[PDB]
Design a protein around this ligand. Structure first.
Ligand SMILES: Nc1ncnc2c1ncn2[C@@H]1O[C@H](CSCC[C@H](N)C(=O)O)[C@@H](O)[C@H]1O
Length: 225
């Protein structure tokens, strides 16, 4: 494992020290994201390779439905889902200004919550859920609880689409300069993670990131019976 650029601006380096505890890490996570959005360093928002994941989830729903956007950022995917007729709940640690014009355009069809995914209450509220680059930044000890919340929030026939950084070789854990964690996955590794979280993968796509010279891995799953 060697340091490498993960996006236009950020080089990430393999973690070699003991990780910050999950409680401390939550603050590191919020701090980096709020600074990045404030500064306009959210280079993911306008990356063209980020657009296929939402269309993939819609294809697996096939109808207007109720969709959770977990880690929704500025709302690009939320707008995409609303344009298909979905009702959407968008959740993020950081509330950006762009949620207001979206609320104006879509009214009661969109709901926004500026909270961690883990704070979402309820069960069986959504037909679909999209994680477009959120899970792969969580503390590894929090993957299970994060995915279990998604799993519980989905209805029995729910679909979950997740996009992560694709690894070249066995996936490793890295950190950016602000100490945000980045996990890259192989397809077997991501499938194994989902199966352990009681999801059964039904599709997976390697989405090129041409300007970054990398790929996203976009996997869709149902609940395991
Ligand atoms: N535990 C958590 N709960 C809610 N949002 C989180 C989170 N951890 C990270 N995030 C948010 O996850 C997003 C990852 S960046 C991707 C943003 C958006 N999905 C897009 O497609 O552009 C950031 O907006 C970050 O603030």
């Amino acid at each position: 494992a060697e340091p490498h650029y993960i996006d236009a601006q950020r080089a990430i380096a393999p973690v070699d020290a003991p990780l910050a505890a999950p409680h401390e890490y939550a603050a590191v996570l919020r701090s980096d994201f709020v600074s990045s959005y404030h500064d306009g360093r959210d280079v993911w928002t306008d990356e063209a390779a980020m657009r296929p994941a939402s269309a993939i989830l819609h294809a697996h729903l096939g109808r207007p439905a109720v969709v959770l956007d977990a880690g929704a950022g500025r709302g690009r995917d939320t707008a995409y889902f609303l344009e298909q007729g979905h009702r959407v709940t968008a959740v993020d640690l950081v509330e950006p200004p762009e949620w207001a014009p979206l609320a104006q355009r879509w009214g009661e069809r969109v709901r926004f919550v500026a909270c961690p995914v883990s704070e979402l209450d309820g069960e069986a509220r959504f037909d679909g859920a999209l994680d477009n680059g959120c899970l792969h930044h969580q503390h590894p000890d929090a993957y299970g609880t994060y995915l279990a919340r998604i799993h519980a929030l989905l209805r029995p026939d729910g679909r979950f689409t997740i996009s992560v950084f694709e690894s070249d070789g066995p996936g490793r854990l890295y950190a950016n300069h602000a100490q945000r964690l980045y996990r890259e996955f192989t397809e077997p590794e991501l499938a194994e993670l989902l199966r352990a979280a009681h999801f059964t993968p039904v599709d997976s796509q390697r989405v090129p990131r041409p300007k970054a010279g990398l790929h996203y891995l976009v996997m869709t799953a149902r609940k395991t019976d």
